[PDB]
């Protein structure tokens, strides 16, 4: 519930948390909040995870069809406009708030998309429940035309702040860098949180539990 994106000197850097929770307890610590769309387009989704996943899948399929028909690389713009119109047709009932980053023929682009269908092209965007911490980090330590490592560190710090100041994000950070030339997608970018081992290991063997009936059906 903490995703962010930024444009640096070359292209786009996207980052996301991993604490996918339903209700109030953590349901997963390895959510894939940075969806692939095109070899030059990624999008980070927040909100209803099923809706975000279906939206990203539909957009990826539509841009696959478009790019393969036109013989050109997909455009962040054609993705942003499709997302806008599709969400506006459903009047925001698709609980998906998206950060669409990519690199196209006209240059790197970053867009913020709201579930009602509103979109905006901004150099740095944050989204999700923990969006405010990352937004503050960006407002504090953002510069125009930053280097690759500077952008990576800035996004990492923003995700760390969102993780540590929100109760719906954590347990990992995912990064994806798109440029005019290279696309990197490093999921376990940095694991700022570890787990101590169980000090007293408690194991059981057969005969510790009571079973009523056994039914073996060997397969081949």
């Amino acid at each position: 519930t903490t995703i962010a994106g930024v444009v640096y000197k070359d292209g786009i850097v996207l980052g996301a948390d991993t604490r996918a929770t339903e209700g109030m307890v953590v349901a997963d610590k390895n959510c894939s909040k940075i969806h692939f769309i095109s070899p030059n387009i990624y999008c980070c989704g927040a909100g209803t995870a099923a809706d975000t996943d279906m939206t990203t899948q539909l957009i990826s399929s539509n841009l696959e069809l478009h790019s393969l028909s036109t013989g050109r690389l997909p455009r962040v713009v054609t993705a942003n406009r499709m997302l806008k119109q599709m969400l506006f047709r459903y009047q925001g009932y698709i609980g998906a708030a998206l950060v669409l980053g990519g690199v196209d023929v006209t240059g790197p682009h970053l867009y913020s998309i709201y579930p009602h269908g509103s979109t905006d092209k901004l150099p740095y965007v944050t989204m999700g429940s923990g969006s405010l911490a990352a937004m503050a980090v960006f407002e504090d330590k953002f510069r125009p035309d930053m280097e690759e490592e500077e952008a990576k560190n800035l996004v990492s710090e923003a995700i760390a702040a969102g993780i540590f100041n929100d109760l719906g994000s954590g347990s990992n950070i995912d990064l994806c860098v798109i440029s005019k030339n290279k696309l990197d997608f490093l999921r376990p970018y940095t694991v700022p949180n570890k787990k101590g081992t169980r000090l007293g290991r408690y194991r059981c063997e057969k005969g510790t539990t009571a079973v009523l009936t056994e039914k073996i059906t060997p397969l081949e």
């Binding site: 899948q57 539909l58 399929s61 696959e64 069809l65 393969l68 028909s69 013989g71």
Partner: protein, 232 residues
């Protein structure tokens, strides 16, 4: 728009779909193409004979991909090929959306066959005037499918559609091996294409696609002419 509800394709007294036979005749009269299988991939080749060089032979493409792992070529009418490949792309995208896994080539060919059958048995339409050679890779295996305007399909290790297609088939049978490599498949395909080109093939006039475990990809004229030079 009203739409005719009577099928233009009808059973002849002998039961033969003479309209489908005429469609296959149009396929034969169209530009020839060949497809061949290797032990680890599929190669599709075809010739694009335009008019005089005023046509930008580079601008237009004949070999077309459906997915990253499926490509195809046609023998027949380009107008039908465009709509057919567009619909096949839509079907593959819909399957990927539904099942979050790449389309199997067999299932894609089955869907294309169903579409062709719907065209042939429906009203107000014309049967498609193309024969599709479809290359695909999935589960670490190659697949090459013949699809006819009649709507049927087959898994063919080698095939040749168009003019002199029976002789191309015989030549492929003679020059086909069970355990050949992709290099041998390319040699055989280019050999058949030059044996049935009728007019001194060129790298621009030959367009080839290769499908293997790395996906489907169309060879650019550079390595195209490289292989023509290596094959003589």
């Amino acid at each position: 728009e009203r739409g005719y509800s009577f099928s233009l394709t009808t059973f002849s007294p002998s039961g033969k779909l003479v309209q489908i036979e005429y469609a296959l005749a149009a396929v034969a009269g169209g530009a020839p193409s060949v497809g061949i299988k290797a032990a680890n991939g599929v190669v599709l080749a075809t010739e694009k004979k335009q008019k005089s060089i005023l046509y930008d032979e580079r601008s237009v493409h004949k070999v077309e991909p459906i997915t990253k792992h499926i490509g195809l070529v046609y023998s027949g009418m380009g107008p039908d090929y465009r709509v057919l490949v567009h619909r096949a792309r839509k079907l593959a995208q819909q399957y990927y959306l539904v099942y979050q896994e790449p389309i199997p080539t067999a299932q894609l060919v089955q869907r294309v066959a169903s579409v062709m059958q719907e065209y042939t048995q429906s009203g107000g339409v014309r049967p498609f005037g193309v024969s599709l050679l479809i290359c695909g890779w999935n589960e670490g295996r190659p697949y090459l499918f013949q699809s006819d305007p009649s709507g049927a399909y087959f898994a063919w290790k080698a095939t040749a559609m168009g003019k002199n297609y029976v002789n191309g088939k015989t030549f492929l049978e003679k020059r086909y091996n069970e355990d050949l490599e992709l290099e041998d498949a390319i040699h055989t395909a280019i050999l058949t294409l030059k044996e049935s080109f009728e007019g001194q093939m060129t790298e621009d006039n030959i367009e080839v696609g290769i499908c293997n475990e790395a996906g489907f990809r169309r060879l650019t004229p550079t390595e195209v002419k490289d292989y023509l030079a290596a094959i003589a």
